[PDB]
Design a protein around this motif. Structure first.
Motif, mmCIF file in Angstrom:
data_model
loop_
_atom_site.group_PDB
_atom_site.id
_atom_site.type_symbol
_atom_site.label_atom_id
_atom_site.label_comp_id
_atom_site.label_asym_id
_atom_site.label_seq_id
_atom_site.Cartn_x
_atom_site.Cartn_y
_atom_site.Cartn_z
ATOM 1 N N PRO A 77 -34.146 -7.924 -14.000
ATOM 2 C CA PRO A 77 -34.108 -7.312 -12.662
ATOM 3 C C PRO A 77 -32.756 -7.525 -12.007
ATOM 4 C CG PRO A 77 -36.073 -8.736 -12.981
ATOM 5 C CD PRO A 77 -35.119 -9.025 -14.090
ATOM 6 N N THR A 78 -32.202 -6.450 -11.465
ATOM 7 C CA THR A 78 -30.871 -6.485 -10.857
ATOM 8 C C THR A 78 -30.737 -5.302 -9.917
ATOM 9 O OG1 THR A 78 -28.508 -6.095 -11.301
ATOM 10 C CG2 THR A 78 -30.076 -5.432 -13.000
ATOM 11 N N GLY A 128 -35.839 -1.712 -5.913
ATOM 12 C CA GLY A 128 -35.598 -1.130 -4.605
ATOM 13 C C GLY A 128 -34.137 -1.204 -4.180
ATOM 14 N N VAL A 131 -30.890 -5.858 -1.326
ATOM 15 C CA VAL A 131 -30.407 -6.958 -2.136
ATOM 16 C C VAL A 131 -31.235 -8.216 -1.906
ATOM 17 C CG1 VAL A 131 -28.442 -8.466 -2.673
ATOM 18 C CG2 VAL A 131 -28.059 -6.048 -2.115
ATOM 19 N N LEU A 132 -31.648 -8.845 -3.004
ATOM 20 C CA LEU A 132 -32.277 -10.158 -2.980
ATOM 21 C C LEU A 132 -31.283 -11.160 -3.549
ATOM 22 C CD1 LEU A 132 -35.715 -9.068 -4.484
ATOM 23 C CD2 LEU A 132 -34.916 -8.927 -2.111
HETATM 24 N N1 LIG Z 1 -32.806 -5.456 -5.411
HETATM 25 C C1 LIG Z 1 -32.631 -6.633 -6.194
HETATM 26 N N2 LIG Z 1 -31.870 -7.645 -5.746
HETATM 27 C C2 LIG Z 1 -31.695 -8.765 -6.470
HETATM 28 C C3 LIG Z 1 -32.303 -8.902 -7.709
HETATM 29 C C4 LIG Z 1 -33.094 -7.870 -8.199
HETATM 30 C C5 LIG Z 1 -33.258 -6.728 -7.430
HETATM 31 N N3 LIG Z 1 -34.053 -5.643 -7.880
HETATM 32 O O1 LIG Z 1 -34.142 -4.640 -7.184
HETATM 33 O O2 LIG Z 1 -34.708 -5.710 -9.079
#
Ligand SMILES: Nc1ncccc1[N+](=O)[O-]
Lengths: 204, 215
Positions: A77-78, A128, A131-132
């Motif tokens: 996930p990114t 989505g 940002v996480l």
């Molecule tokens: N949106 C994201 N932000 C950080 C890690 C993973 C994320 N994502 O959307 O899978």
């Protein structure tokens, strides 16, 4: 029967929390198990300069070497990923082995995914446009969207249940009409209106 | 300081918020409190759902129980967040906006949703935002609540295009070399290369961001 291995430096975050009906096995692994130094180091300054850190290839390479097989689908996930959608969840729900690599959003050294992709299928995905700090919450979302599709459009409109009158608001009388063709048509129109209002992208 | 209340029938599941997480509580910048929705039931079996009017699969959460809960927890200054696949999109802009709020209340629902009158009623006295974190279906709003909290809290004071690939040491690994420009120290060429890599990745993975048709 599905196997899910999650690798993260926050294993407690992903500790499942009480659906154990023996349908799926989910194992969580602390990434620091594969560090090399007494400081248990998992990231390092980015080449080319800039803020934050990048996760070390030597550490991730070892972790995935031990955990993955040729049959593995590696999920990363990114925020820079392909979009994760319901179609994706459906595809992944019939996989034997999912491995989810949780990293900080600045990323895992790209050579890790690039190397893995020469031996197994790799999918870099975003849940989505926000940002996480890291992939952990995204992993929870992916795990839930996928596992609920394992045995054991337009938006949906408003739903209602008892009582028929509550704080001055009545359930739409049509829902109590016993005319089920009309109820469907009413629900269709409610869906149209809601989709127009909230998600016009879905209508083209 | 910010206050976040989360209301759910699975309170233990909002444990991932805890200590070793960005979810900030330890630094005293936010206080997160989780409430078992069943606390506002009065019957013996603590029932929170019922079959839908008009037919259809699944159950709908009762308005009466949610009403009492929100009466006790919300004020007129509260921003009520209701995660739902039928919501307005939750975006980065939404995250920035909510990062300045005094009080978020997150109503986590299950089955097929909460009786619409709950959100309608609440809106007569506070701001309400029904939102979707993405185009996939979850069993309930709980995981979406964790995502929203993570996205908002990292923006709180005191805490476009796709990012291209990143690298760190060693400069060669399993016969794979870091792009030489990144080792050159030429800030202008590195900026140019990264700009390019980002547009290559965006056109491939997210053409929509640049105003092109999606696959
Ligand atoms: N949106 C994201 N932000 C950080 C890690 C993973 C994320 N994502 O959307 O899978």
């Amino acid at each position: 029967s599905m196997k899910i291995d999650v690798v993260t430096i926050f294993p407690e975050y992903l500790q499942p929390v009480r659906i154990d009906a023996g349908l799926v096995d989910v194992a969580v692994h602390d990434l620091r198990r594969w560090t090399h130094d007494v400081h248990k180091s998992v990231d390092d300054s980015p080449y080319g300069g800039g803020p934050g850190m990048v996760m070390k290839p030597t550490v991730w390479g070892d972790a995935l070497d031990e955990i993955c097989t040729s049959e593995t689908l590696l999920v990363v996930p990114t925020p820079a990923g392909y979009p994760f959608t319901q179609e994706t969840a459906w595809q992944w729900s019939t996989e034997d082995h999912l491995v989810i690599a949780c990293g900080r959003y600045e990323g895992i050294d790209q050579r890790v995914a690039d190397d893995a992709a020469t031996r197994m299928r790799v999918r870099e995905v975003s849940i989505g446009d926000y940002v996480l700090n890291g992939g952990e919450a995204a992993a929870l979302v992916i795990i839930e969207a996928v596992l609920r599709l394992v045995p054991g459009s337009l938006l949906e409109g408003p739903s209602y249940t008892r009582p028929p009158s509550w704080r001055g608001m009545d359930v739409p009388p049509v829902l109590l009409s016993g005319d089920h063709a009309k109820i469907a048509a009413w629900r269709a129109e409610q869906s149209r209106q809601r989709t127009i209002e909230r998600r016009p992208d879905l209508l083209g």
